[PDB]
């Protein structure tokens, strides 16, 4: 019976019926979860013969629906949240009652007052439901947390039970009872504990720093930790940028208790923990294609000329360079990935370099690469330390366990790394970049943690000509300045000239003018579906084309120019497959092969 039901609580549950009933969108949502479990419950049982339980609730709704219940949750989470949860549990028990738990709420929002950043926080905002965003570091090691106990007892058979209430259980405070760990049942029989019957729930606590881009000019950062349980655990790695919404607690006694300075350790409970995107960090594409978008793609896929339009869509502000833009798309797509059975994998993605006199937009192009790229990290010259490396950070952090802190190229995995002033970078690093690019993996033997960890990143680099403007006239070699294998590793070496002409000049002038006085939005959405759906494989339409082409290249160009190897061939295949992705075709084609041919030609000539 506990403390028996009270019409405070009674009203707070009952009033939260009509909503959620209106807006009804949640009522079936719960059902859906049930469904998804049921099916999967049918999958384990019959075939060889799961989801978290929390359901998001928009704060938008309450304003229309209930003002007081709104203002109440925000202002007093302690009193309104647990009855709400109670209600939704009751409902969830109603939906499918027959076959045989918290059922927590998210609280999306529609924030807030109460929108605040970890720099500006407490003590007016104390014990209210807060939205706090920022870098996540240092995170923490996940530990299972013990809740119920079970014991066997001989000779009387039976079994037992126990419950454990932490300081952080529920929300509101409760008169604490330590249960010991029951052993030595009375009468005096021993108790052999048993596992796997006794439940556990995982536990994690991550600290959140204030946003470094939204940081003050300079000052020390100041962070606040957050506790996360069960379904919320492990969602975010350290270094992500994260919006955490949840209660803010005073928990603990502040020295007032033991009578004999600092006080009242405070932390945030739950709750939503959204991973989100910000430039250079933490995914996030994501993206939502709805009903209509995917249809737009599907319609647009059939049109034969689309590739050129797409390739023009990148450059509102940049002339010509249609070939280069074409390239950047062909990097965004990137030749699937192929991992042979019991053998090494052939590199999927395509790497690019740009060399030309300054004003070539080479440094200007790359930022626009970055924005729509869906990741990745940018790196400029030096740069470093370690670039992509974990650096094998000494020491401890914490308690003395040696752990790794991932550099760029690792953190940039499945993404587009930018490199500016690629020539300036110390050879010491380049030595590592060889290992990164083709081989596709990073290897750290340093002290230390000894591991081979995977960075499969795609790469762009812009690098000034050797000395002055001399690139244009200067020889096919001695111009690059960064021999040798690197020149090969890069799939495409594109050269651009700043050499001047009056006509071209005028044609520059007008567009520059109008600038100061296929839409980018739909571009990346166009891209993600293209990326995970679907890989075109390979077809005997094309192969003879790229073989003819390749052999041509070696035989004739080795008289013309350099370098040419099997590497070039690999690149041919990657380009073919990429342009296949652009075509959305489930297959590789001959036309595509001809395209790859074309761009690799303008690369060479």
């Amino acid at each position: 019976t506990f403390f028996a039901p009270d019409a405070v609580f009674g009203d707070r549950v009952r009033r939260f019926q009509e909503f959620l009933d209106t807006f009804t969108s949640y009522r079936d949502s719960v059902r859906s979860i049930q469904v998804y479990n049921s099916n999967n419950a049918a999958n384990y049982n019959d075939d060889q013969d799961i989801l978290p339980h929390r359901i998001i609730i928009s704060l938008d709704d309450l304003r229309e629906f209930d003002r007081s219940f709104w203002s109440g949750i925000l202002v007093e989470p302690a009193y309104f949240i647990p009855p709400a949860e109670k209600a939704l549990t009751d409902l969830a028990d109603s939906m499918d009652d027959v076959p045989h738990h918290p059922w927590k709420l998210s609280f999306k929002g529609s924030f807030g007052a109460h929108a605040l950043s970890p720099r500006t926080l407490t003590a007016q905002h104390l014990n209210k439901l807060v939205s706090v965003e920022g870098i996540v570091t240092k995170t923490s090691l996940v530990r299972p947390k013990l809740i119920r106990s079970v014991h066997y007892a001989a000779k009387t058979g039976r079994f037992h039970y126990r419950d454990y209430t932490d300081a952080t259980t529920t929300l509101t405070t409760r008169i604490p009872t330590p249960a010991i760990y029951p052993t030595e049942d009375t009468e005096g029989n021993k108790l052999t504990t048993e596992y796997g019957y006794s439940t556990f729930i995982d536990h994690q606590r991550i600290t959140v720093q204030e946003m470094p881009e939204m940081a003050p000019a300079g000052q020390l950062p100041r962070s606040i930790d957050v506790i996360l349980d069960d379904d919320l655990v492990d969602k975010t790695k350290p270094g992500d940028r994260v919006n955490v919404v949840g209660v803010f607690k005073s928990l603990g006694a502040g020295g007032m208790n033991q009578s004999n300075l600092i006080g009242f350790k405070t932390l945030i409970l739950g709750n939503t923990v959204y991973p989100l995107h910000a430039r250079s960090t933490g995914v996030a594409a994501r993206q939502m294609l709805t009903d209509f978008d995917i249809r737009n793609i599907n319609k647009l896929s059939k049109k034969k000329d689309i590739f050129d339009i797409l390739s023009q869509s990148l450059a509102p502000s940049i002339y010509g360079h249609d070939h280069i833009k074409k390239a950047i798309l062909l990097m965004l797509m990137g030749g699937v990935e192929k991992n042979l059975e019991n053998g090494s994998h052939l590199r999927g993605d395509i790497n690019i370099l740009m060399v030309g006199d300054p004003s070539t937009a080479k440094s200007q192009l790359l930022r626009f690469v970055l924005n729509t790229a869906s990741l990745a990290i940018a790196t400029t010259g030096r740069g470093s330390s370690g670039v992509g490396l974990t650096a094998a950070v000494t020491t401890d952090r914490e308690t003395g366990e040696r752990r790794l802190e991932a550099g760029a190229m690792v953190l940039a995995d499945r993404g587009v790394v930018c490199i500016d002033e690629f020539d300036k970078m110390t050879d010491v690093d380049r030595v590592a970049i060889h290992e990164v690019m083709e081989q596709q993996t990073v290897t750290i033997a340093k002290a230390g943690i000894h591991t081979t960890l995977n960075a499969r990143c795609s790469v762009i680099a812009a690098a000034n000509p050797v000395f002055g403007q001399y690139d244009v006239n200067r020889d096919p070699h001695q111009n690059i300045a960064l021999p040798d294998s690197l020149l090969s590793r890069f799939d495409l070496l594109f050269v651009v000239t700043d050499d001047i002409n009056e006509i071209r000049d005028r044609s520059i002038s007008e567009h520059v003018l109008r600038t100061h006085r296929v839409t980018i939005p739909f571009l990346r959405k166009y891209v993600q579906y293209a990326k995970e759906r679907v890989i075109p494989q390979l077809t005997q339409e094309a192969i003879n084309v790229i073989v003819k082409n390749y052999t041509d290249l070696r035989n004739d160009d080795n008289t013309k120019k350099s370098p040419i190897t099997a590497r070039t061939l690999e690149t041919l295949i990657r380009l073919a497959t990429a342009h296949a992705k652009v075509r959305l075709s489930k297959t590789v084609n001959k036309v595509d092969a001809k395209v790859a041919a074309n761009l690799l030609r303008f690369a060479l000539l």
Binding site: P358, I508, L513
Partner: protein
């Protein structure tokens, strides 16, 4: 020596920079006495400071005010160029490109980037933002 080639081994620095002013001091007794006498005035008897102050009474700005003014203009209004000014500047830059190419037919050692044009633009908007006007004018650029 060639005008560039000064900074390290590379002129690229000078390429990034919009407005490069080489300053020269040559000795002209007229001008040298001008500058000198001016400095003698500067130290004390503060006669120059005074002159500034009557410039303040009559015309000139206290520079404590100038600041507040700059903040003002900077936040309030964002200027935009006029079309005839634009085409004007097109003519400007194509004459630059053409003529100075012709100059560099001889491989005359020195430069021209569209970045420089963009600079010229930013000057026009800057000065437009002086007059505080939401719109540019031709003369306005002619300076």
């Amino acid at each position: 020596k060639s005008p560039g080639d000064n900074i390290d081994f590379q002129t690229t620095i000078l390429s990034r920079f919009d407005m490069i002013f080489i300053v020269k001091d040559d000795h002209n007794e007229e001008r040298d006495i001008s500058i000198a006498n001016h400095v003698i005035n500067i130290h004390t008897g503060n006669a120059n400071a005074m002159q500034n102050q009557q410039e303040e009474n009559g015309s000139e700005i206290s520079i404590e005010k100038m600041k507040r003014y700059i903040t003002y203009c900077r936040l309030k209004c964002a200027p935009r160029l006029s079309p005839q000014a634009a085409e004007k500047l097109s003519s400007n830059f194509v004459t630059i490109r053409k003529q100075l190419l012709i100059n560099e037919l001889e491989s005359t050692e020195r430069p021209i980037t569209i970045r420089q044009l963009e600079a010229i633009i930013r000057i026009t908007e800057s000065l437009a933002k002086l007059e505080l006007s939401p719109i540019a004018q031709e003369r306005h650029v002619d300076e």
